[PDB]
Amino acid sequence: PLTASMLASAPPQEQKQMLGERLFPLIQAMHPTLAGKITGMLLEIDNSELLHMLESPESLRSKVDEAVAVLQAHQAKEAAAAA
């Protein structure tokens, strides 16, 4: 289990790496092809929010739904621009 205190002694890029290694396998179980992209999108948010999502499966699942909708929106935006 990854805690605020384990993150606190690491430099910020290492903190994002440690959160990433815990989130990636959960996100990969949901969306194997998008797991790298969705993990990257979630790592941009506040570390406190990321620790909450590792403790609350319902919060993580909703945030992954937000990431999937955001990717769909971006694909639609690009299709609108090309048409």
């Binding site: 990433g20 290694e21 790298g36 993990t39 990257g40 999108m41 941009e44 929106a73 971006h74």
Partner: peptide
């Protein structure tokens, strides 16, 4: 606002 669709991929 919403998540960033241009975020860099995480590679584990």
């Amino acid at each position: 606002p919403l998540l960033n669709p241009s975020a860099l991929e995480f590679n584990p």
